[PDB]
Amino acid sequence: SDSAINVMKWKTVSTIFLVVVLYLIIGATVFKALEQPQEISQRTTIVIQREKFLRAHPCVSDQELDELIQQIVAAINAGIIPLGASSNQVSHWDLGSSFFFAGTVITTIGFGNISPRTEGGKIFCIIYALLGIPLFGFLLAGVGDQLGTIFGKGIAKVEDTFIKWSQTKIRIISTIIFILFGCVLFVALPAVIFKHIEGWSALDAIYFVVITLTTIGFGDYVAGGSLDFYKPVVWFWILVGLAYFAAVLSMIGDWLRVIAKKTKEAVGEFRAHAAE
Amino acid sequence: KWKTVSTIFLVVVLYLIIGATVFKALEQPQEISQRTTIVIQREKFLRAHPCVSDQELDELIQQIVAAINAGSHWDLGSSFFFAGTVITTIGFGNISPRTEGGKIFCIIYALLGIPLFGFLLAGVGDQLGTIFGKGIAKVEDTFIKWNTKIRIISTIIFILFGCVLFVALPAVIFKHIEGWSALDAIYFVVITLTTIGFGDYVAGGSDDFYKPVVWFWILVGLAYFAAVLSMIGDWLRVIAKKTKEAVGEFRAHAAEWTANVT
Numbered sequence A: 001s002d003s004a005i006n007v008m009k010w011k012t013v014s015t016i017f018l019v020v021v022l023y024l025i026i027g028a029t030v031f032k033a034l035e036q037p038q039e040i041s042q043r044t045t046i047v048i049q050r051e052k053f054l055r056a057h058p059c060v061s062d063q064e065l066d067e068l069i070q071q072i073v074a075a076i077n078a079g080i081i082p083l084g085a086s087s088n089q090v091s092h093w094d095l096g097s098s099f100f101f102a103g104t105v106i107t108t109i110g111f112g113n114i115s116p117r118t119e120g121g122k123i124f125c126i127i128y129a130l131l132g133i134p135l136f137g138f139l140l141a142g143v144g145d146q147l148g149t150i151f152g153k154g155i156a157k158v159e160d161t162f163i164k165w166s167q168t169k170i171r172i173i174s175t176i177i178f179i180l181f182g183c184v185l186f187v188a189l190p191a192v193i194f195k196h197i198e199g200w201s202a203l204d205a206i207y208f209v210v211i212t213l214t215t216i217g218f219g220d221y222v223a224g225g226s227l228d229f230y231k232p233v234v235w236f237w238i239l240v241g242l243a244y245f246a247a248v249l250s251m252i253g254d255w256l257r258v259i260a261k262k263t264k265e266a267v268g269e270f271r272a273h274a275a276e
Numbered sequence B: 001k002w003k004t005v006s007t008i009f010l011v012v013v014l015y016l017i018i019g020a021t022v023f024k025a026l027e028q029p030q031e032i033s034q035r036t037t038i039v040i041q042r043e044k045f046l047r048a049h050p051c052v053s054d055q056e057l058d059e060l061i062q063q064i065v066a067a068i069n070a071g072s073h074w075d076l077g078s079s080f081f082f083a084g085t086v087i088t089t090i091g092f093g094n095i096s097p098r099t100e101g102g103k104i105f106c107i108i109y110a111l112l113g114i115p116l117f118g119f120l121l122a123g124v125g126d127q128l129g130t131i132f133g134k135g136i137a138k139v140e141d142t143f144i145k146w147n148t149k150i151r152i153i154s155t156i157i158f159i160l161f162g163c164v165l166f167v168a169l170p171a172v173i174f175k176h177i178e179g180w181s182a183l184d185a186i187y188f189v190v191i192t193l194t195t196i197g198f199g200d201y202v203a204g205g206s207d208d209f210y211k212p213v214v215w216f217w218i219l220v221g222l223a224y225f226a227a228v229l230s231m232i233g234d235w236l237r238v239i240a241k242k243t244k245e246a247v248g249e250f251r252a253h254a255a256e257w258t259a260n261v262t
């Protein structure tokens, strides 16, 4: 009964492993069905513009033109805007941007738009993270409980205004108004204000909002690029929005417990009778 | 009634301000070195090739900048690893979806995959947390009866043997493939398994016995830092309670000090 439940646990983990593997295979085929075609469209139309530029200027160093392009791609790893118009440039590690960089590291967002290139900054970032990630975690948990009780007060009013002539079902009305206001306060309202500032689409905003507050942080779209009244309230929104998806992603996990137990007993009965 | 969050808020803001000044002290110098020497190669190129001119180079750069939005990627295996980043919330960003449908799929794929992977990780964490538990049951006998502080010797051997298993040795298997420095490896290892994932260092550059085991290592290494980052939070809880009573005494001894001086 000590190492029995361990045998009962290893069976549980191994099944979840295959669920994730299949889930990754499911997603993979969907992305390469959605992305690999439009890749080859650009892949073949960039070969057009190369042979445009090579024949229009044969006296360019043909075999040493990619060496130019790749040293620009090596320079993509820095925030370059190397041009003849605006040869003068601005720091990407300035007084405010390095503050935002640390904001990504402790939240583990880490967009990657700007990464440290100095061996000193790398060793500092390692220690700054190993200490800042837990530090920020206690802030978030406090903000989560702080916000989780602000929600508790607003629902005490609403769960009286709908008391006509059961508990188990009133709980569902309460969970709706959280996601309702939540996707308004922490999805809708931010994504809209990012649309008039960043000039995105309507999807690019919510895509950004999700990728950011799910602490995935690709860095393809970043809000820190665009008053400077702006960036202080942004990382504040992130703090509370991270606390928001923390509950959202935790609720989705609870739903998947139910769906796992419903489908366990379902196939259990399905295979048990087998004659129906 | 007591918030206690406001005080933690200022600690983080202060901690961000500390880190910020340190980073621009560390990075803004070498930024100027590179960005003044990129202006070097640019006038190098126009002088070494009068064939090319100013009015002919910006259109080359901007179409490379248009290629920044693109770069076979997304192949049979690459899209698998892409999904591996999304559910773990690593998200290097080396390759991101450009299609309107791929974004809407990625949003849903994450909202469902992140919690799903969380149950896998929690099982692997408890699975590994008891594998470690049996190794220390042996060790917490052989020299513990022999001659509060015994906890500390045991906790060292975890970080010791863990930073071997989950930092040292994995960092040196990737030196097989691309080991430039001893720092870039451990920098990569930390940034990866902390789920920060900048993407400046990843295996996708200049790229099948390798990539399957790597994602496996990630699964177990993510569980490793999960405990490591959770232990560090516990020690900070201790250090917070140590420094609470410390100011408690010094503000108390200075209290009736100012009364004794009357």
Ligand SMILES: CCCCCCCO[C@@H]1O[C@H](CO)[C@@H](O)[C@H](O)[C@H]1O
Binding pocket: B175, B176, B177
């Ligand atoms: C784990 C096996 C231990 C064997 C140690 C051998 C180390 O050599 C490495 O072998 C790699 C081939 O795989 C090459 O790419 C690298 O040139 C080199 O760094």
Ligand SMILES: CCCCCCCCCCCCCCCC
Binding pocket: A123, A126, A127
């Ligand atoms: C490359 C940066 C390394 C920073 C981490 C230091 C190693 C881990 C600390 C081990 C030092 C001995 C234990 C003393 C208490 C921290």
Ligand SMILES: CCCCCCCCCCCCCCCC
Binding pocket: A023, A256, A259, A260
């Ligand atoms: C034991 C049955 C394994 C197959 C379960 C269905 C896999 C379909 C993946 C997408 C479903 C996600 C929601 C349900 C999670 C169990």
Ligand SMILES: CCCCCCCCCCCC
Binding pocket: B014, B015, B018, B243
């Ligand atoms: C890098 C962080 C340095 C220490 C932060 C200040 C600690 C003193 C404030 C604690 C008040 C209780």
Ligand SMILES: CCCCCCCCCCCC
Binding pocket: A131, B011, B236, B239, B240, B243
């Ligand atoms: C070298 C110390 C790095 C900062 C981590 C400890 C700071 C203590 C935080 C104060 C808690 C109230």
Ligand SMILES: CCCCCCCCCC
Binding pocket: B104, B107, B108, B111
């Ligand atoms: C534009 C698509 C918006 C709907 C995304 C899916 C909603 C999931 C709610 C949890």
Ligand SMILES: CCCCCCCC
Binding pocket: none
């Ligand atoms: C409660 C947030 C409202 C912010 C509005 C800013 C524009 C006036």
Ligand SMILES: CCCCCCCC
Binding pocket: none
């Ligand atoms: C966002 C909802 C997608 C619905 C597709 C059909 C589900 C069976």
Ligand SMILES: CCCCC
Binding pocket: A119, A120, A121, A123, A124
């Ligand atoms: C090597 C740089 C360390 C800064 C704390």
Ligand SMILES: [K+]
Binding pocket: A108, A109, A110, A215, A216, A217, B089, B090, B091, B195, B196, B197
């Ligand atoms: K991330």
Ligand SMILES: [K+]
Binding pocket: A107, A108, A109, A214, A215, A216, B088, B089, B090, B194, B195, B196
């Ligand atoms: K993360």
